[PDB]
Amino acid sequence: TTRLTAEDINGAWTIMPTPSTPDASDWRSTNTVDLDETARIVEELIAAGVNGILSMGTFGECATLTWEEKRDYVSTVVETIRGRVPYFCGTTALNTREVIRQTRELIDIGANGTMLGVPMWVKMDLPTAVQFYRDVAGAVPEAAIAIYANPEAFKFDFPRPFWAEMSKIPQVVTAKYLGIGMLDLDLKLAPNIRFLPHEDDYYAAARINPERITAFWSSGAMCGPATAIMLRDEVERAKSTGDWIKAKAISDDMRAADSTLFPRGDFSEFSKYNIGLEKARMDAAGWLKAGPCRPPYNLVPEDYLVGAQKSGKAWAALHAKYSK
Amino acid sequence: TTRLTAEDINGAWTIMPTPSTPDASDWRSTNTVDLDETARIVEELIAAGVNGILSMGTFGECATLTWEEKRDYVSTVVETIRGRVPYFCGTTALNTREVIRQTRELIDIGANGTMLGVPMWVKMDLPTAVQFYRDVAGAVPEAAIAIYANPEAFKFDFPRPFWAEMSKIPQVVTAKYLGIGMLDLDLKLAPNIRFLPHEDDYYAAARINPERITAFWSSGAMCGPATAIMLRDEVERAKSTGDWIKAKAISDDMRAADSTLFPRGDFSEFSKYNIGLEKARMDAAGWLKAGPCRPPYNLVPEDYLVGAQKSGKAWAALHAKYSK
């Protein structure tokens, strides 16, 4: 049974992509994971001071990797991490039995937990979703669980009584969270979960509840982690001094760097191109090579890609600005 | 390369479930396919006079079967069919490479085609969806394809220019179609596809275009196929005589038998419980045993199940009424 709890989740939790070889967009290609780049990214993230590593959500291409590719990737990540930081794989699948099979194998390789959405061919209702997480936690009690709360991908909306239920499952220690409109209530309903806001929302959420909101998730770190590290460090200081001016400046900079990412500012259009826009942004920032998208999600309108590439450049510029 | 064309698709095409053993709702269970019942259903469908067999869509539990279970099921279906009627498996998956792998293997076992939706973790756009079907058809040209046009399950809406594109792919010979509001236009845009309306819509669609609308899909046949056979036979006669009165009576009977199926008459609520409501309806009609639902989709509100069970009884009553 897992000994991870919410108390162990603090600071900057960075979601890394699954690096692609140049042929990864071709359906004829198998073994499209660049394992040299995977290991290099892991070493640089740990050296930059990240607190934890997440992987294999939507832009991590959980949907489009082969099972053999997933095993190779996680083996390399675990081997390179060498237990220095906690690591969550991603085992979202179309049904409960395949999630359980994948979670057992990846935890055995050495992952500490799974970032887990819900099966989505058929939209789930509340008791079905609760039972799904209870089944997985009871079948694989050694795995910690991060709720992957993505309503666009998974159809289910992750409502208030769902969070109350998750808090009663010991394995559920954290969540890649929604917007923060109901964060105040969800914190009260779910005392045992470290809710991770998106990095851009971390400033506001940490001011709402500085006791509970001690960590955030970041994909911008894949463009250069110094900005997220600085946000973490400055928010820590602001909680003591009451001086949030510099934390506010970093956070406002991050929102500006993200302003061109969503096509026409539309979040539902971003969700349709989530994979290619995130990977294109990372490629443009030049801090790592994310590489091409595996099929079918390998076609993005060129003007949408320009917005993502400009975002990558803005984030790379922030990495330079906040390097220390 | 496949020699099936739309000209080979006529009459009553019945979608069969994947029969479950009694323990199928338990995530601990593997090998939950009742292969004795699978073979029995195939023999009775062929003896009743069905023209073709579809399988492994949503209520066929394509999402929740294991790969080993799928292979066993298709092997038994193919072995029992013995080439007497065409047979489409279902190979919808989360990505293009896994669809191609599954389609190659099931066609090699002996299926003539695949009933194929689109990957749905990320909502697809039009050029991505078109390229997905083109990739699969080119990778497995020996497989005929039935478009599984289910917007609730697959998010993509299957719009007019999509049908124009599908008609230019030789392997795409048929479609489990939408409502018929745009059927007139889609027939004009897609000359090479046999569009299958739902059995309840077949009367209206066959009157719109009796040259093109010669076949329909049915799940009500799993409650007793004599009603669908009678609809097929009577519509054929009506196209010659101009006397649609008896075809109208059968069709109105079928709509009445379906009236309690959707919870509160709400189609989006039906879609959330599509699997359990269809299988519960079949169990209640007593013509075959569909058995329990594989996880996670094994919890249905009890009042919703009553509506499905009453529908199963009404369909069983129609089977008796139209037996000959």
UniProtKB/Swiss-Prot annotation, chains A, B:
EC main group: lyase
Function: Involved in the naphthalene upper catabolic pathway. Catalyzes the transformation of trans-O-hydroxybenzylidenepyruvate (THBPA) to salicylaldehyde and pyruvate. The reaction is reversible. Can also use substrate which carry trans-alpha,beta-unsaturated keto acid side chain and adjacent hydroxyl group such as trans-4-(3-hydroxy-2-thianaphthenyl)-2-oxo-but-3-enoate, trans-4-(3-hydroxy-2-benzofuranyl)-2-oxobut-3-enoate, and trans-4-(3-hydroxy-2-thienyl)-2-oxobut-3-enoate.
Keywords, sorted A to Z: Aromatic hydrocarbons catabolism, Lyase, Plasmid, Pyruvate
Metal-binding as UniProt keyword: no
EC id: 4.1.2.45
Highest rank taxon of the organism: Bacteria
Protein name: Trans-O-hydroxybenzylidenepyruvate hydratase-aldolase
Organism: Pseudomonas putida (Arthrobacter siderocapsulatus)
GO terms for biological process, alphabetical: naphthalene catabolic process
